[PDB]
Design a protein around this ligand. Structure first.
Ligand SMILES: CC(=O)N[C@H]1[C@H]([C@H](O)[C@H](O)CO)OC(C(=O)O)=C[C@@H]1O
Length: 624
């Protein structure tokens, strides 16, 4: 982790002690491993909840739920056991503690097991399982001229009575919380995203919520796909966003406007973006996923390990920042190549913290980190986002003023800034690589075999921030052709393969001064007319499997065709700009490209016409 940042080993493996209560007797007991961090703020007191695995890190062993709390931002802590297991056997355990804060109360939901030695999803029945809720009340005193906190943990109550034997077809077996930190919805509901099994041993996610302060609970009727576990959720613009774990696959993300009655995959923003390993073929993880306000902008924070080592090692814990449009990698929170899987991020009084695991030889500690550097970076990126959105929106468009340039769904913008080999994203998330490029105001001039710029889509590798483009996009640019080509040459497009030979949608230009719009695999029909040196406005749109190509605000003749067979979903390799950037491709595009914009939707007619009219006003050169 970053410059200026620091940590301590707070929950220390084989060292920290907790008050182990059995049969009315308490003994300070050393704990082998601590896992499943949840870090929250209750009325100014920081509270950290986790598993205390007494003798071993094996999942199916002796576990109580431990809590530490601090009134001085983590400088000093008191320690308690928030929830004890049944003591029925040497493997009795309360597990996957999931926390909600409302007023001065901490709602903690745990699974409770008595004697099984096997993993929960493997169970053929529910005989060893219960689902419990404990409430902790947090009070503060200023006696003695100091702040003293205390937390009184009530007895756990079983919520089993609220679990229906049947759901939309299936028969239910067990459920648990998704671990970490859940929420109170804007309407006051307590909301836990939960992981549920059926008699087929399939796992799936749902919304489990209470409209009466936790006295009664209900299930939404919809669900995730099968295979989605450990769900984590936040509320964004009136809707729940449910971020799920999928072992051996990319993470799936869903939105619901009705407490889980209906679930829609968020294909246009966050779903399938985050991979659980470099090859997305290893176990997933628990993730922190919260909505916060920083310097007045509403955003989301998300953590997940990169897992270069594989299996459940889960090294290299990374933190991400997004506004539901752009997706920025803040960086690695953990240190070196240490194993570091589960985590919890907290933003309190304009300070950022992380409670996370470190794992050596299957012995786990939780470190408590002060993310000083990470918050500095975050605030710089958010400033950049605000500044450019402000710039675009402040432009008085050719009428007094016409309609504003749209920033809604604007994800990336290539304009004046660039280096010898990169065209820089003004929004700072994804740069394009270049070859044979010369800098010019608000863009690049390209020439020669192998020339052009490449804006990676699936090529981003593990984490694919532009996976929305396989469902809808609008890509815009101003282009100027300097030489008549020998035969069709490319200007702009979306490629389905690494070379650019198989295109989803694109535009090329030919020796007869015609345009060559390319609609999927359809045979190309040249059309319209172009002139050398003239600056043209180009827009490619794709939505609902149909692509269109506009020139100067006007649809090329024949635009509006099918570019995706309704069976399949595309896997776009990259966008190419100003050529293919492939030496293996024989084309030589001699062109200047300025002001490339990528939106995560199909722009409408008015929007398209406004961008056309304000071409010469949107560049970044004059304002840095
Ligand atoms: C009850 C239980 O076994 N929980 C385990 C959990 C589980 O797999 C998931 O919460 C449900 O599918 O996974 C992990 C894990 O480090 O990957 C830690 C927990 O020990």
């Amino acid at each position: 982790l970053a410059p200026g940042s620091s940590r301590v080993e707070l929950f220390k493996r084989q060292s920290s002690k907790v008050p182990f209560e059995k049969d009315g007797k308490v003994t300070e007991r050393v704990v082998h491993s601590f896992r499943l961090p949840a870090l929250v703020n209750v009325d100014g007191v920081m509270v950290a909840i986790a598993d205390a695995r007494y003798e071993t890190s094996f999942d199916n062993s002796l576990i109580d739920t431990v809590a530490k709390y601090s009134v001085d931002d983590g400088e000093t802590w008191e320690t308690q056991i928030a929830i004890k297991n049944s003591r029925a056997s040497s493997v009795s355990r309360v597990v996957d503690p999931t926390v909600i804060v409302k007023g001065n109360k901490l709602y903690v939901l745990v699974g409770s097991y008595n004697s099984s030695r096997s993993y929960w999803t493997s169970h053929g029945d529910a005989r060893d399982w219960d689902i419990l809720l404990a409430v902790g009340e947090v009070t503060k005193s200023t006696a003695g001229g100091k702040i003293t906190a205390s937390i009184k943990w009530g007895s756990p109550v079983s919520l089993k009575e609220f679990f229906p034997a049947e759901m939309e077809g299936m028969h239910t077996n067990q459920f648990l919380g998704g671990a970490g930190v859940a929420i109170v919805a804007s309407n006051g509901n307590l909301v836990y995203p939960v992981q549920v099994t059926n008699k087929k041993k399939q796992v799936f996610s749902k919304i489990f919520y209470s409209e009466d302060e936790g006295k009664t609970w209900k299930f939404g009727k919809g669900r995730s796909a099968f295979g989605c576990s450990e769900p984590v959720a936040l509320e964004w613009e009136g809707k729940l966003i449910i971020n799920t774990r999928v072992d051996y696959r990319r993470r799936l993300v869903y939105e619901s406007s009705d407490m889980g009655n209906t679930w829609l995959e968020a294909v246009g923003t966050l779903s399938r973006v985050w991979g659980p390993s470099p090859k997305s073929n290893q176990p997933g993880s628990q993730s922190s996923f919260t909505a916060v306000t920083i310097e007045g902008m509403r955003v989301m924070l998300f953590t997940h390990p990169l897992n270069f080592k594989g299996r459940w090692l889960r090294d290299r814990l990374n933190l991400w920042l997004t506004d539901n449009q752009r997706i920025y990698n803040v960086g690695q929170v953990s240190i070196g190549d240490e194993n570091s899987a589960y985590s919890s991020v907290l933003y309190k009084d304009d300070k950022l913290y992380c409670l996370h695991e470190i794992n050596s030889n299957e012995v786990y500690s939780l470190v408590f980190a002060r993310l000083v550097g990470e918050l500095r970076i975050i605030k710089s990126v958010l400033q950049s986002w605000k500044n450019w959105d402000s710039h675009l929106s402040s432009i008085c468009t050719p009428a007094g003023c016409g309609p504003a340039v749209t920033t809604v769904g604007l994800v990336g913008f290539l304009s004046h800034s660039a280096t010898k080999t990169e065209w820089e994203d003004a929004y700072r998330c994804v740069n394009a690589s270049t070859a044979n490029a010369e800098r010019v105001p608000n863009g690049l001039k390209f020439a020669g075999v192998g020339g052009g710029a490449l804006w990676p889509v699936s090529q981003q590798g593990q984490n694919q921030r532009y996976h929305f483009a396989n469902h809808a996009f609008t890509l815009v640019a101003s282009v100027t052709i300097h030489e008549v080509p020998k035969g069709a040459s490319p200007l702009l497009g979306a490629s389905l393969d690494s070379s650019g030979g198989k295109k989803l949608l694109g535009l090329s230009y030919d020796k007869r001064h015609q345009w060559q719009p390319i609609y999927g695999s359809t045979p190309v029909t040249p059309t319209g007319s172009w002139e050398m040196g003239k600056r043209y406005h180009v827009v490619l749109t794709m939505a609902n499997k149909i692509g269109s190509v506009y020139i100067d605000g006007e649809p090329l003749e024949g635009s509006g065709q099918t570019v995706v067979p309704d069976e399949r979903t595309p896997d776009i390799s990259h966008f190419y700009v100003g050529g293919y950037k492939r030496s293996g491709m024989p084309t030589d595009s001699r062109v200047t490209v300025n002001n490339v914009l990528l939106y995560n939707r199909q722009l409408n007619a008015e929007e398209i016409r406004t961008l056309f009219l304000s071409q010469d006003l949107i560049g970044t050169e004059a304002h840095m």
